[PDB]
Amino acid sequence: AVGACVLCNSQTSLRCGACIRRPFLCCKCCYDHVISTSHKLVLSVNPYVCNAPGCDVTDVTQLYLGGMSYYCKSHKPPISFPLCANGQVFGLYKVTDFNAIATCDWTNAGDYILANTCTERLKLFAAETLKATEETFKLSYGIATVREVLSDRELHLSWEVGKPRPPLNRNYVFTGYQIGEYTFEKDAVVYRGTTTYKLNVGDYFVLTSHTVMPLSAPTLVPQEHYVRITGLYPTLNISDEFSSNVANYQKVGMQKYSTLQGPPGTGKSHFAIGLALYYPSARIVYTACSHAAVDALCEKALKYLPIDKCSRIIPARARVECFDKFKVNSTLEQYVFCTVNALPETTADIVVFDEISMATNYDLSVVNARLRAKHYVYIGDPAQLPAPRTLLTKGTLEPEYFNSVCRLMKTIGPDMFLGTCRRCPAEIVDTVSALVYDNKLKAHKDKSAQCFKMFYKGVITHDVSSAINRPQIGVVREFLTRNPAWRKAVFISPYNSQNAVASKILGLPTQTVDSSQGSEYDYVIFTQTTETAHSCNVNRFNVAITRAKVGILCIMSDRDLYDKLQFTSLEI
Ligand SMILES: [Zn+2]
Ligand SMILES: [Zn+2]
Ligand SMILES: [Zn+2]
């Protein structure tokens, strides 16, 4: 009931009853809010509503202070004061950007632009409002119910009518009923339940709708620059293997927080684990939003750090199988590997937050609120993929607006940049260097002469909204017959339905561009499928072609990206 104004910090009893998150607004800011938005309900110790029996006047601009109570113009006594007047709303302790965040529906890109350009307190207000909006929207979808048990991995389903049916993709992890988190993918559909339980006919599932907690900590702590390495103890016996990062590790210890832009295969995980060998007594918490990003840090640590000082934090609700080689759930070990949403309340000498393009301002804040560290390291690449914004349907979200860390990397530049790609053949490195890295990314490898491109629009079919291009898969089939070494390639496309079709026709392992991020393969076969904003997205295209260590075949739909690929063209 008592607190500080989100816009000016002036103390108040006044909150907005029309905002989904009921923020405290001072007498001045509350007035500026109510008089320019449809938000007219104001909440003090008691709500600002007409106290006359049966009266439904709740608009603050139509209410007055009559004695110790509130009344409308129709019910107030002769000695009464308007609650709204003189640029202030009556309350104890006596804007444009706040209004827009408070009233938007989060379906436009401009909403996320504003949520990243505003003041720090407005960033938390926006992040809390957005996440609560996202969670409420999850209730709009309808409940599902098991129609039959086709086999151990397949089935056919039934829905409750009247409410919209969400898409069948590995993008919507539903929680099961308490029978583990289930997922779906394409009348013969596939039930993907992480927990091996015979799906009882009649049971139901609901979207993973977790309650949104308030944010208190900023997305980024205030920057502090030091003249000496603070609270960390370096070595001069630093392995030659990590010597290239020595100046950057010293930079880490001389600032409160630091940003590292690491293009694909430039050594992000090597840098993160090497930071532990450079400050060998430091307690490091390694965090990322996904279990995949956390497990990739676990694999690198397994090679350089002592296994007895590592612990993989796994929440009681075992969602998917993750890293099995560290002692599970020991918060006090020197090296703790844990996803953002599962972080314990602890302190650290260094916090390493990896895959920063996938973080939201909500995640940035959670880390600041759960971990109190001497140093914070943000590793990622704003030229890679951001977290999916399920409400966003209009406009494209540019990298400078992914989150606060990405905004800094795009506006003032990152503090550290890993300039040499060690993974990809030079054809790929040269293409992405010009496309998203302003020619600052260099190739370690020579050209492989196994990077091919083909311009083939094919035929686009749609599975509801997800796209398929059977002729592009047919072209891959013909290529495989003449290129048997490509037998072990991973098939990548921007669409789950295209991948399901390629999996049956080609028999190759499949991956969407979004799920390939952070992974690498000798050979990659990419079919663009369509020429939509989704399939032409430069960050997605960058991720797609940088998965390859040796060769890549790109079957393209977009002339622009096809011309930019510095690959040998194929005919047919
Ligand atoms: Zn104020
Ligand atoms: Zn409001
Ligand atoms: Zn009244």
Author numbering: 1 to 94, 103 to 185, 194 to 202, 207 to 592
Publication excerpt:
The SARS-CoV-2 Non-structural protein 13 (NSP13) has been identified as a target for anti-virals due to its high sequence conservation and essential role in viral replication. NSP13 is a 67 kDa protein that belongs to the helicase superfamily 1B, it utilizes the energy of nucleotide triphosphate hydrolysis to catalyze the unwinding of double-stranded DNA or RNA in a 5′ to 3′ direction. NSP13 contains 5 domains, a N-terminal Zinc binding domain (ZBD) that coordinates 3 structural Zinc ions, a helical “stalk” domain, a beta-barrel 1B domain and two “RecA like” helicase subdomains 1 A and 2 A that contain the residues responsible for nucleotide binding and hydrolysis. The nucleotide binding site is situated in a cleft between the 1A and 2A domains with specific contacts to the nucleotide provided by conserved helicase motifs I, II, and III in the 1A domain and IV, V, and VI in the 2A domain.
To identify possible starting points for the development of NSP13 inhibitors we have performed an X-ray crystallographic fragment screen. The phosphate-bound NSP13 crystals show robust crystallization behavior and routinely diffract to around 2.0 Å resolution, sufficient for the reliable identification of binders. X-ray analysis of the majority of crystals showed no bound compounds; however, 65 bound fragments were found within 52 datasets using the PANDDA algorithm. Whilst these fragments do represent useful starting points for inhibitor development they have not yet been validated as inhibitors in biochemical assays or as binders in alternate biophysical assays and are not expected to be potent inhibitors without further optimization (see, for example,34–36).
